[PDB]
Design a protein around this ligand. Structure first.
Ligand code: HEM
Ligand SMILES: N#Cc1ccc(NC(=O)NCc2cnc3scc(C#CC4CC4)n23)cc1
Length: 370
């Protein structure tokens, strides 16, 4: 894979993200690094309004442009949502809104915190020479002490890395169909099934690092967006870049490239049929980095793996293909159980529209079995 910014170790995640910005930008990173205390102390909003307008021209390489986008997205969430108790600011000041909207046009991402910010660019190893495990990793930014953003972001990142071993198999799946190598195709499919089955275990780690009350009452408050949100019904005003208020969706793992890429690989048409779920997954492609959007489009341009396997009357191929579909179904069923524990039950102590979305996506997956 060429310039799709896919890493063979960490997949769609940004490999070894930049931790520090140039000194020109320490006014940005002091705030971001101290969001827990600046929010709690009611000082955060005022330091945002205190800030001088910086130019983005001192951010040279790709990693610093991404880190900065992470820094400014977290400051926007903090500023818009404050202490997370419902008192909203509906205008984001220009000394932050202009350089944030400038950088996002530069990266073809919307000016809100997305999955590629706080999951794919929001990590480090503790010791660079020890492996990629929860114990040797940390996030770079959080919102409030005890918000479990470390557990939530890291475990998701760990699933993205576990899926990377399946992604590197994709080129051989398509070459084997073209070159008509049935034995190679069968083994490439069983290899993809194994990786996705191993990713189900990584999901299990969520129960040890995220708490249902902290997730529902704090973390998701700060990840919320302003599209269809009654708290900013007309969207957010970006000071001195648009005079109208503009609506952007909160961050979602519907923005993850990795479950979309296996739906496309296996010919599961998650984006067909005109339902709300198909609509949401298409739109969330604009919230992915353009390189990964480009990868998904190129995947769709390749001949259907499902059609090829259906065409050949080969029980061995049919069962290797079904092994991947079942492994996708298993991930989405366990995930649904996670949502029942971390959203449905807390909300009982709204939640039904998102579960019908996830049930629609799971059932679509399930109906691709042969
Ligand atoms: C506390 C744990 C979790 C909760 C409460 C949760 C909740 C949700 C919700 C409400 C949605 C649908 C709306 C939205 O996208 O924002 C969703 C979608 C999604 N989530 Fe999570 N999630 C959790 C953990 C994870 C983990 C660890 C992953 C691994 C990467 C993940 C991957 C996904 C994916 C891929 C989707 C898109 C729908 C699909 O492909 O089936 N989630 N999640
Ligand atoms: N009531 C309620 C209610 C509660 C939560 C949500 N949505 C939500 O948290 N989406 C993000 C998400 C879903 N799954 C996963 S894994 C890693 C991430 C992430 C992230 C940062 C945001 C980019 N995500 C909707 C409604």
């Amino acid at each position: 894979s060429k310039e799709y910014h896919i890493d063979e170790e960490v997949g769609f995640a940004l490999p070894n993200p930049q931790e520090n910005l140039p000194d020109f930008y320490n006014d940005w990173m002091f705030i971001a690094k101290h969001l827990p205390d600046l929010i709690e102390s009611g000082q955060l909003r005022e330091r945002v309004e205190k800030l001088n307008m910086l130019s983005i021209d001192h951010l040279t390489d790709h990693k610093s442009q991404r880190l900065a986008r992470l820094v400014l997205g977290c400051i926007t969430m903090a500023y818009v949502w404050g202490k997370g108790h419902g008192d909203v600011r509906k205008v984001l000041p220009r000394n932050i809104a202009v350089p944030y909207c400038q950088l996002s046009k530069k990266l073809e991402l919307p000016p809100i915190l997305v999955y590629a910010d706080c999951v794919l660019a929001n990590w480090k190893k503790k010791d660079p020479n020890k492996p990629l495990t929860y114990e040797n990793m940390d996030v770079l930014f959080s919102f409030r002490d005890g918000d479990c953003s470390k557990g939530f972001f890291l475990v998701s990142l760990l699933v993205e890395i576990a899926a990377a071993s399946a992604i590197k198999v994709i080129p051989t799946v398509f070459k084997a169909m073209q070159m008509q190598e049935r034995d190679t195709l069968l083994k490439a499919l069983l290899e993809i099934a194994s990786c996705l089955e191993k990713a189900l275990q990584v999901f299990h780690q969520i129960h040890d690092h995220v708490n249902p009350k902290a997730f529902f009452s704090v973390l998701r408050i700060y990840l919320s967006g302003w599209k269809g949100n009654p708290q900013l019904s007309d969207g957010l005003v970006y000071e001195g870049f648009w005079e109208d208020p503009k609506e952007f969706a909160g961050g979602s793992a519907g923005q993850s490239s990795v479950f979309q890429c296996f739906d496309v690989l296996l010919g599961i048409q998650q984006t067909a049929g005109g339902g709300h779920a198909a609509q949401f997954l298409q739109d969330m492609r604009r919230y992915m980095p353009p390189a990964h959007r480009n990868f998904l489009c190129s995947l769709e341009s390749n001949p259907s793996v499902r059609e090829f396997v259906l065409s050949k009357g080969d029980a061995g191929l049919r069962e290797a293909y079904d092994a991947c579909v079942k492994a996708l179904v298993s991930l989405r069923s366990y995930h649904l159980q996670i949502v029942t524990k971390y959203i449905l039950i807390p909300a009982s102590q709204g939640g039904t529209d998102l579960m019908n979305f996830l049930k629609t996506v799971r059932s679509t997956t399930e109906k691709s079995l042969l």
